[PDB]
Every structure is written in C-alpha cells, then in structure tokens.
C-alpha cells in the first residue's frame, strides 16, 4: 500500500506549514532537528493527532483514510509500554485476545502468534519475563522486538515507528533496522522517525523526508539527498556522514532559502505531478472486562510492593496496636483508650489508601495507546482495573486488622459487633481509595496528587470528632463536617463499641447519675460527642460512605472519558 | 605541563588492566563504549578515585603527583552543579572567594574574575541568573561555559572534563570544543572523555586514547588512528566517520586479539620508550562559614517553595485552627478542646519538619565535588548550612502559629505562658528537623528517607499520650515513650495550659471533690495523664528535646564525615 500526503498543514499557531510527498513499500525515514516537524508529521500520517488542526489531505492507494484506519495499521511507541512482569508469549496473547476477531479458535490465534514470534526471532525468550525493577529479564533489543510483535498480530499493511532506535546501542540498532529491512521485503510499508543515524544505517533507506521548523527541506529517494545538497551549493568531505551533513546545513554549518530551493528543485515537480495523478467495537464489553482484569491480576501477582509488603505492614502494625492496647478496662482510662484506638484504626485506613493514586497514573501511556488503537471501551477498562487491582487489596487489610486487634483489645464480644467493625473498616478504605482515584485519574505525576490527598485528609481529620467536639463549632463552619470520610467511619465504630458499656467501677449510673459531671456510661459519652443513640445513628454513616464511593468513582470515570488522547 | 601514566591497573575485581600513555599541551580525547575504561581512567588521572585500587604510577613533568594536586588542577563535571539562582558573576565570585589566597584584595580577585569571564565570552550574561525551575535564564551552552570558568579561577595547568559535549546540541558542542581548542593554544593541557564524537569534532584532537573492557586499544596522535586500524586489517568507506568506525571494530562490526595487536604495534614501542626516559586548608574556618552561609542564603531567597509557600501555608492553617477552636470554654468540652488543639499543634510541627530531608540530599553532588576540590572543611560546610537554611525556616512558623492562635483560642492570658508555648513549639521543630537530617544525610534520594521519617512519626505519635493513656501500658513496652519527640512537646504544652484551670461550672473543687470520677480541674487531668505537677515536670521536656537535637546533629555530621567521596 502507498500512503500519499498532499498540502498538509497543522495548527495548535502553525507547526506544519505546507508539506507534500508519497511513501511506498520499503523502509521510509523522517529526519531533522527535534523541535522540527519530524514527530508531528508521523502522528498526522498515523491519525494520532487531533483532526481539528489538520488542513491537507492523506490518501491510501488513491482513496481517503477511513475513520477505521487506527485499527488496520500498526503504530510502535518510542519508549516501550509492554508489560514487564508478563512473559513475551503472554504480551502477544493479550494483543491477539483483543485485536483479532471473536470468530477465531484459540489454535487459529496461536497460528497468528507463532508466525509472528518466529518472524521476529524471539524463540529463545518466548517464555521469559520482559523485565521489571524486581525481576531481571529480557534485554532492551528484545524488548523493542516484543513491542513490534504486538502490532504485527493484525498483519498491518503500514507500520509507523516513533524514533525506533533512539534508546538502543549501535550494535542493537543495526540488528533492529536489518530486521525492519527484511520485513519491508514482505511488501509492508514501514514509516519511521529517527535521531542522527550512522552512515551504516542511512544506506538502508528507500526514501528520505527532511523537516526543519515546520518547513520541508527534502523529499525523495534517500541516496539522492547527498547529490541534491551538493548540487544546491554545499560540500561533503571524505570521512563524514551525510545524515549529520544535512542537519549541519539546517543549523547553518536561512530556512527560507532551503524551503525556496526545494520548491524550485526537480524532486518537488516530480512529487507534485504524482499527487495530482493520485487525486483522480470489534468485541463485546464482557470479553474486554475478562481480559483486562486477567492482565491486571497477573501484574498484581508479579510485584512484591503492591501486595506482600502492604500485607506484612498490616500484620505487624496490627500486632503492635494489639500489644499497646492489650486488655481494655472498664475504668476512668477506658473511654480514652477506646476513643484513641478506634481513631487510629480509621485514620490509618485513610493514609494507607493514599497509595491508590498510583493505580491509573503509572498506566497512563499504555492506556492512551491501547484506547486509540481500539483494544477496549473506557467502561470495560475502568471496571476491569477496579475489579482486579483495587477490590482485593482493600478487603484483605480490613479483615486482617479486625481479626488481630479485636480479641487482644477485648472489644464487644458479640458476632454482629465484630462484623460491623469489619464492614465499617472496609467501607472507609473503599471511600478513601475512590477519592484518591478521583484526584489522580488523568494526571501524569504521583507527587502533586499525593500532596493534595494528604492535605485533604488532615483537614478531614480535624472534623473527625476526637480533636474538637463537633457540638461546639460555630454554625458557619459546622457544615464542613459532612464532607469528611474519617468522621463517618469513626462515628460508626464509636456507636458499635460504646453502647451498653460502664466506666465508673462501683457506681451503677444506669437509672440516674448521683453527681452530674461523672460520665459513667458509653451512652453519656456518645450523646456528649453529638452521636445519635438509635440504630439509624449507626447506619446513616454507611449510606454516606456508599454515596461518596459512587460520586468519586463517577468523577474518576468522567476524567478518563474526557481526557485528551491525541 | 605533560601528564604521563605507566602500568596503570585499578581494582574495586580489575576494571583497568594495564595502561600506558603520555598527555601533552593541547586537546586530548579518551574514547570507547560506556562500560569501558574511559571514565575510570579520567578519574584515576585526576585523582578522583580511591587510591586503594591503583597499582601503577602517574607522573607530571617527570615528578610524582603531590597530595596537593586536587587543588592545583581543574575538573569539570559532566552534568553542571552550578547555582541556578545565583548570577554568573556571583558563581565565579564564590569560587574566587574560596580557591584564591586570603592575601589578595577584592580588586586583585576581580582582575582574576574579569580575565576569566572575558576569555570565556560570557560578557552578555555576566549579571543574568543561571536558570532554575521557577526562573528562565542562561542557556545550556553558556551554563557549561560557567562551570568551566569556576575551574579557571586558579589558572590550572591541567583541565579534566568528563563528557563535556554530552547533553548539548551539535552547534553548541562545536562552540564548546572550539573554545577548548583556543584555550589549549594558551599552553593548558586539556584531557576529556566523549560519547561518540561527530567527524567535525574528531578532526580537532591532538591525541586519542581508545579503551574497551578495561583494555587499551590505541594511544597516539589522533589522526593516525584511522591509518593504524586500516593497517591492522579493517576498512573505512567514503562518507563514514572514523570515530564511529572505531567503536564498530570494538563491537565486532575479540578485544583480547585487538589488545595483543596494540602491544605489537609501533605506537606502543614509541610510548613505552618515553615512560623509561621519564622515571629515571588554604583559608580559615570562619571565612568558609561566612561564604557558605552567604551562598546558602541567596539560594533560599531565590526560591518560592523553600520560603514563601511554607509561610503562606502556616498563616492559612493558623487562621483555620483559630476559627474552629475560637473562644475555648471552662465546661465539660473544654478539656477535650485544649487536649486536641495542643496535640494538633505539636504533630503538625513534626510532619511539616519532614521537608528537612531535602536539605543535604539535593546538594550532595555539589558538596562532594567542592569538598574533594578543597573549597572548605566538612565542619564549616555543615555549620554554615545549618546556620543559613535550617535556623530561620524553623523560627518563623513557630512564632506565626503562636501569635495567630493564642488570643483567638484564649489560652492562659500570661506573658510567660505565651513565651513558653512559643519556645516549646520551636524546640519540637528543631528536634524533628534534626532527626530528619540524621536519617537523610549521605543518602542520594528523597523518597526512602521521607517514608522512614513518616513511619517513625506515626509510631512516636501513638506514644504521645492522647491516643493511649501512658500510665496503662505494659512495663515491657512502656520505656518506648522516652524515644518520642511529639510527647515532650505535648507534655510541656499541657502542663503550661492546664495548671489552675477549672472545668465543672457551678462546682468549686480545689480542696475536695464531692464525687470522684468528675475530673473538674487541670491538675486532676495532668496527674491522670501521668504528668508531674512540679516546675521540673515542665522543664524536663526541654532538656530532653535539647539532647535529641545534639545527638541527631552529631549523627548528621558523622554521616558527612564518613561518607565515601570517591
């Protein structure tokens, strides 16, 4: 297939001014200084930029690009987004599971995967892990081959590669470009940008496009560029690389001179004639949920910090709290101990839930690439990642804390009281985690979200009801208490512990209190905190946490729905 | 001056195997793959590596390197350590203030600075800022020139540069090496490493040294290397860069074969002959503290986040606390409010002091370079940085919090009570900050220190005396309370507030309490927390904070004293 671009202009302010050319089966290179057109032309040709700025026309075999083009062509990112804790077989299987039709038997998909994994020369690493911070594995050259194979699953007629060797050593980079030249002889059209290639690479190209400051400096067959610039009036010595000599001419050893010469040059008139001659979801929501969740689960298991470390810290902190508060009493210190331990337990669920900021932020480049490439809906992605990562890692620490502390402290020895604590600790973890996803979703860095989360919890924790008595606050601040996640958790836990407790030994204060100030039963403590003694006074806190979950998970979804992909 | 090296070997496991060569007035380049000897030879030649491994001999004009050599020669780092918020004039003035003799008048130092700043062609930027995150300034080419000028202050006979063109665009990299060739014609010996030079750079070299896997592979005049490798049996085509062709030969288009050829080659025998024709503080502590403190203060004023932002956050949080706790009462809620507000104030001084981790960590590369270069003692550096950065940024927020909250809350209306709160809030800030410097000093990353600091404060804050009554804890944990910084602050504040308060309106309770359990005066509250009612019960907490300051600032100093510089 031949890809032809006519009178391309693009504006954000122009960045591509007017560009004309054709690209053909073979190996086609786009070169120039980094701030020039080189990357933006690749992303216009690939339909990776926003159509609002594009002012020219792009055709395939003389017919317009379909809106479907992003699904029928391959595009390989500069820095590889491949799963470092899956194996090479599993990464190709996830691509095949979602880019191939639902018609095909698993053997008919493995025939596609086997043709691909053999053609790329990955046979010795097919079952090796792709390498992670905690896992030594497959090398950077094989990591680049793996990323190319995820696009070859669909037999794309056109491959786009962003900067494919700008990150690899020269003795790897030649093997990657020799692999690409063998692929081009299969009839695939390969279009790519590069940074300062060696002479050893430049000899391989079937076409060259050269761009500076959004002006075209050359387009034609690649080996003619040296003769063109020596004819235009420059000089190359012996022992010097043409690909550096071109960028040297652009840098003045002015771009208006170089643009005007090309408009007058033979290679333009031949290109202009050719362009006037040429101008004559795949899959259900359920299957996407299933495979997104599956990949996300293998990733959770392939990492110590996201799983084992948080479980170990939970068990250790549970036993430390269990030792300090061992054997709670019914005396003058018993209220202070029960108030303080339940306040530690809820605020610890909030600050340990700040790690949820990292859920979408680390995946952002992979999500945007896979979403533009049509792997899945935003709905099945967002649900498949909640269901796989967030759900189990917030059940477990809530169950563990309750089983360890409860019978060490000697909290109320009733079955429903134990399960109401366990359910209340779990609701405050999902609520705090949902607020983290609402702050974090669509952002590119962990640090600003982590700060904003931390600042929110210290203000919410003032309005918790331990540090200030909420019945005393002035009416014009008092409504701020309804916005606090720690308060609904702490109120539900205090209701559940204190009802029917006594704290004045030798004094039956149940029917009367003989001196007014003594505070001898847990009902007197609860009403003095402004808590409601009815069963609705317990459950009102859980409906509030369920609402904060639903609102924040909607804000997190709408943030991914209206994020800018291009 | 000529620098010569004979039979150099180095081990950590060998990394330099056996190396011989001479370097002379002119421009001398060290080349090869990144994991090879190239950087380690430069740091052996420069005396920037630990002498424990060095097994050969290095010799200047036929005499040994003196221990003084690090002070008499220039060394320029790969990534520039220059002060991005000082100006070019000020950066050169700080180098001149410490590397030149104390004998010289300020005009005799400005004559040195003016000769240097003119010779580097910096005249249009002498009074421009060197560029920071919040401050647009001098470009990367003139930023590299500024770093070279900080070494030229001493008129060094030898300059070493690690990777001087790496990280600069090709026109800037030429301008830097054209500047260096003009400097070499002044009779200075310039020795440097490069990552793969363009042909148009390689033509400039007066000598070439080529290294791979800790073997020497060429040493001679630079233009002879192509003829040597074409004689040894390789082939260079037209249109190809020799400097890439050498690294291609080293990559096998084996290193033992190429090392054996060099041992037999004419250029070895000629080098070996000459190596047998050969071989047959500046300033007081006070001045260093004065100038270190001065640089550090200009840097604090040149940044928004390190100063203005923490003051604004302090004033806002002070007024928010002042509104929530407005007008404290002498009723059943008055103990809870006074306990909770004083606990917020001390724990906020701990967590806001976690930012002290960043003090030495961000300066680490600059400190090690300047210390090896003999700018200052570790004593005058460490004191000059405490005195300048840490001291004012821990007084101010403590004074501001006290002036805002005290009369909004209506804490005890006595002059000494107000100053004892202000002094107690200030001691807990210096103590928490000193613990941060003890954890952080000598580490290279903020994140691990920040986590360890945060984990320490949540365990210290359990033992604070609000959340658990310290009189109830089992004897085998109870001694852990003495290790906690928040507890000494909170105990001193509670002592100062609660003495002589009453909390049961309409009851007098100074001589008796009509019913026990009632808790009607601040002495009953203090003794029920296990606090001592004597004046030593107040002051014991401040001697404890002063001891934690002295211990942690010693651990921070001994960490910089026994850090590995090489």
């Amino acid at each position, epitope marked *: 297939a031949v890809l032809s671009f006519h009178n391309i202009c693009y504006r954000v302010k122009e960045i591509l001014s007017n560009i004309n050319g054709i690209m053909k089966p073979g190996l086609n290179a786009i070169l120039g200084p980094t701030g020039g057109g080189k990357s933006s032309l690749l992303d216009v040709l690939a339909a990776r930029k926003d159509p609002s700025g594009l002012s020219g026309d792009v055709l395939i075999n003389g017919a317009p690009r379909p809106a479907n083009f992003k699904c029928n062509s391959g595009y390989v990112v500069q820095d590889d987004v491949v799963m470092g804790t899956l194996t090479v077989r599993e990464n190709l299987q996830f691509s095949a599971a979602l880019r191939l039709a639902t018609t095909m038997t698993n053997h008919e998909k493995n025939e596609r995967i086997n043709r691909v994994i053999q053609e790329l020369g990955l046979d010795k690493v097919a079952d090796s892990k792709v390498g992670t911070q905690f896992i030594r594995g497959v090398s950077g050259g094989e990591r680049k081959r793996t990323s190319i194979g995820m696009e070859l699953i669909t037999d794309p007629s056109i491959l786009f590669l962003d900067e494919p060797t700008t990150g690899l050593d020269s003795s790897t980079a030649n093997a990657v470009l020799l692999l690409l030249k063998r692929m081009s002889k299969q009839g695939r059209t390969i279009i790519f940008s590069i940074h300062q290639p060696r002479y050893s690479i430049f000899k391989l190209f079937d076409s060259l496009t050269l761009l500076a400051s959004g002006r075209l400096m050359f387009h034609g067959p690649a080996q003619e560029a040296l003769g063109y610039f020596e004819s235009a009036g420059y000089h190359c010595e012996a022992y010097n690389n043409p690909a550096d000599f071109f960028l040297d001419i652009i840098n003045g050893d002015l771009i208006e001179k170089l643009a005007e010469i090309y408009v007058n040059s033979s290679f333009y008139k031949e290109t202009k004639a050719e362009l006037h001659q040429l101008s004559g979801y795949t899959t259900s929501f359920c299957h996407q949920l299933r495979w997104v969740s599956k990949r996300s689960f293998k990733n959770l298991l392939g990492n110590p910090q996201a799983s084992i470390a948080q479980i170990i810290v939970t068990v250790v902190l549970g036993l430390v709290i269990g030792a300090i508060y061992f054997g709670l009493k019914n005396d003058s210190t018993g209220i202070q101990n029960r108030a303080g331990v339940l306040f530690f337990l809820t605020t610890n669920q909030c600050f340990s839930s700040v790690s949820a900021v990292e859920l979408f932020v680390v995946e952002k480049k992979l999500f945007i690439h896979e979403y533009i490439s049509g792997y899945y809906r935003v709905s099945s992605y967002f649900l498949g990642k909640l269901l796989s990562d967030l759900l189990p890692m917030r059940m477990l620490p809530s169950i563990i804390f309750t089983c360890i502390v409860y019978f060490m402290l000697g909290l109320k020895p009733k079955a429903d009281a134990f399960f109401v604590m366990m359910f209340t600790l779990m609701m405050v973890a999902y609520s705090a985690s949902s607020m983290a996803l609402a702050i974090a979703a669509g952002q590119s860095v962990v640090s600003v979200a982590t700060l904003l989360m931390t600042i929110c919890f210290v203000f919410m924790m003032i309005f918790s009801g331990l540090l200030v008595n909420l019945t005393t606050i002035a009416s014009w601040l008092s409504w701020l208490q309804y916005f606090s996640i720690p308060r609904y958790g702490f109120t539900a836990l205090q209701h559940n512990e204190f009802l029917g407790q006594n704290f004045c030994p030798g004094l039956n204060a149940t029917g*009367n209190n003989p001196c*007014n100030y003594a505070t001898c039963t847990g*009902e*007197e403590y609860l009403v003095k905190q402004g808590i409601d003694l009815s069963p609705w006074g317990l459950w009102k806190n859980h409906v509030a946490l369920a609402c904060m979950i639903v609102i924040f998970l909607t804000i997190a979804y709408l943030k991914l729905l209206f994020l800018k992909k291009y | 001056a000529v620098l010569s090296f004979h039979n150099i070997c180095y081990r950590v496991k060998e990394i330099l195997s056996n190396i011989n060569g001479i370097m002379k007035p002119g421009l001398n380049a060290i080349l090869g793959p990144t994991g090879g000897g190239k950087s380690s030879l430069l740091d052996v030649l420069a005396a920037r590596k630990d002498p424990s491994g060095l097994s050969g001999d290095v010799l200047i004009n036929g005499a040994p390197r003196p221990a003084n050599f690090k002070c008499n020669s220039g060394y320029v780092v790969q990534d520039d350590v220059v002060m991005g918020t000082l100006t070019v004039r000020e950066n050169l003035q700080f180098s001149a203030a410490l590397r030149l003799a104390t004998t010289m008048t300020n005009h005799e130092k400005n004559e040195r600075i003016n000769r240097v700043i003119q010779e580097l062609g910096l005249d249009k930027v002498a009074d421009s800022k060197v560029g920071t995150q919040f401050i647009r300034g001098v470009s990367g080419g003139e930023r590299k020139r500024t770093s070279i000028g900080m070494e030229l202050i001493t008129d060094p006979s030898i300059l070493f540069l690690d990777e001087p063109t790496t990280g600069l665009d090709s026109s800037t990299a030429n301008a830097v090496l054209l500047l260096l060739k003009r400097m070499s014609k002044q009779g200075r010996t310039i020795i440097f490493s490069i990552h793969q030079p363009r042909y148009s750079i390689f033509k400039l070299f007066d000598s070439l040294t080529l290294l791979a896997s800790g073997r020497l592979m060429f040493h001679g005049p630079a233009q002879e290397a192509l003829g040597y490798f074409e004689s040894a049996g390789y082939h260079c085509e037209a249109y190809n860069n020799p400097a890439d062709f050498f690294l291609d030969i080293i990559n096998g288009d084996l290193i033992e074969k190429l090392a054996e050829i060099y041992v037999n080659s004419s250029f070895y025998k000629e080098t070996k002959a000459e190596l047998h024709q050969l071989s047959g503080y500046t300033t007081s502590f006070c001045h260093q503290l004065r100038w270190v403190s001065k640089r550090s203060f200009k840097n604090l004023l040149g940044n928004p986040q390190a100063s203005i932002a923490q003051i604004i956050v302090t004033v806002v949080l002070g007024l928010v606390i002042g509104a929530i706790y407005f007008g404290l009462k002498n009723d059943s809620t008055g103990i809870q409010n006074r306990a909770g507000v004083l606990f917020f104030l001390t724990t906020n001084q701990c967590f806001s002091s976690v930012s002290a981790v960043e003090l030495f960590v961000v300066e680490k590369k600059l400190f090690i370079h300047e210390y090896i270069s003999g700018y200052y003692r570790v004593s005058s550096y460490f004191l000059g940085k405490l005195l300048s950065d840490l001291l004012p940024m821990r007084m101010l927020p403590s004074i501001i919090f006290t002036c805002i909250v005290y009369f909004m809350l209506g804490l005890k209306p006595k002059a000494d009570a107000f100053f004892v709160m202000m002094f107690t809030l200030m001691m807990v800030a210096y103590s928490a900050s000193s613990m941060a410097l003890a954890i952080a000093a000598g580490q290279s990353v903020v994140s691990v220190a920040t986590l360890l600091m945060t984990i320490c404060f949540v365990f210290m804050m359990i033992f604070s005396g609000l959340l658990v009554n310290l009189t109830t804890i089992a004897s085998w944990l109870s001694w852990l309370q003495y290790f906690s910084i928040p507890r000494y602050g909170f105990t001193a504040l509670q002592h100062n507030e609660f003495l002589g308060q009453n909390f049961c*309106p*309409g009851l007098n309770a100074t001589g008796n309490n009509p019913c026990n359990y009632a808790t009607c005066t601040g002495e009953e509250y203090l003794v029920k927390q296990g606090i001592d009612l004597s004046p030593w019960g107040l002051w014991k907490n401040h001697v404890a904070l002063a001891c934690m300051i002295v211990i942690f600032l010693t651990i921070a100093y001994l960490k910089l004293l026994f850090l590995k510089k090489y």
Partner: antibody
Amino acid sequence: VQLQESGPGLVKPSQSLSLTCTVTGFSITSDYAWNWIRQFPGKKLEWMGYINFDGGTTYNPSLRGRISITRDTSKNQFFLQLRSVTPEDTATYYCATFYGAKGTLDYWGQGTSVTVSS
Amino acid sequence: DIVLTQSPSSFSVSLGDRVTISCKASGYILNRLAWYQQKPGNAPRLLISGATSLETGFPSRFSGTGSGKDYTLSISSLQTEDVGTYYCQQYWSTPWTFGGGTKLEIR
C-alpha cells in the same frame, strides 16, 4: 441560701435595665454559679445567664450582646445589666443558685417585676 | 438548642385522683431532667432533680418515671396542697430550657 432582688421596677425603651441581687448565709465566691431567670406575662420561663464562683460568665444566645452579669465580692452582690430594653420583654426577674454537682436551681429570690413602655 | 414540650396546657382533675404529666425532649437528655412546682405569686420550687429522684420536703405521693427522650411526672392520690403549675427543665446542654408549663385545675 438566702437571695433578694432589687432595682428600678419601670424603664424606658432603648434604655438599660439593671437589677441587684444580694446574697446572705453563703459567700458568692465560695462554690456555686449565680443565675438570672425571667418569667413572661402569659407564663413561660427563660434562663438568661450566670456568673460562676471564679468570676467566669455565660449567657443565653437569645440575649446576644444585650446582657452582662457582674459582681461585687466586697458585699456578696451580683447584678443583671440588660441594654437596649424593649416593650416586648417586660417580665418577672429572679436570681437563683445552681448547685453544680446536683445540676439544679435549688434556691431562688422572690423575684421582681419590670415594666417597659412608650 | 433543646426544646421541651409538655403536651397539655392544662388538665382538669378531682381531689384524691391520679394524674400524669408528660415532658418530651427534642434531643437525648440522659436523665438531666428536673421538675418545678409553682404556686401563684411565688418562685418555682424544685420537686424532682435527675429524672427519678425526689426532694426532701415533698410527699412520696409524687414520683418521676422517664427515660431516653420521653419523661413523665406522676401523682398517685393527689391532694388540695398539690394544685398549681408544673414545669420540666433540662440541664444537659448549656442553654438551659424549660417546658411550656402545664396547669392542674380542680374538677
């Protein structure tokens, strides 16, 4: 123990009302809190405020900025002073003692009427 | 604040009969409830102090039997000395509040 109100029984709109209470048989700086309570024409009771044995004081929010209570420990007196008085709050004014540990108004004066009119 | 309701403004009862006066709080009061008897031309006199305890100098014919938010004052075998106005008062929250008062009148 023993309480007695006194003061002007008749006052102008926008003027200030002022009642003394004198205590005997006990000392106002010893133990209790000391109250003012008013009873309206068409009987309902409003509690107005107190001064405590230590001289601290507290008021009903219905009287915001209008009321203060003060004392003379030389002679066991305390005083109701109520500014910007209005014909809507003619009442019978009582001083009373709040016992603290028991929580109740155990001792009352006989109370004094106040008339406010144009 | 907390408001007290006494449901009837006035009764009508014979000598020697039984009578029962109801006081409803808006918030929980945890027995911090007192009852006052007022004869015409006199200060209110305390009768019950804490919802179930009776003052020395009143007959055991009176007793109070409340809990939670609902409180009540009982007289069994009332007598001619008992005729008057009765108020409940809460003393839980710092703005102390009386009920609207209820009157006993002979029949």
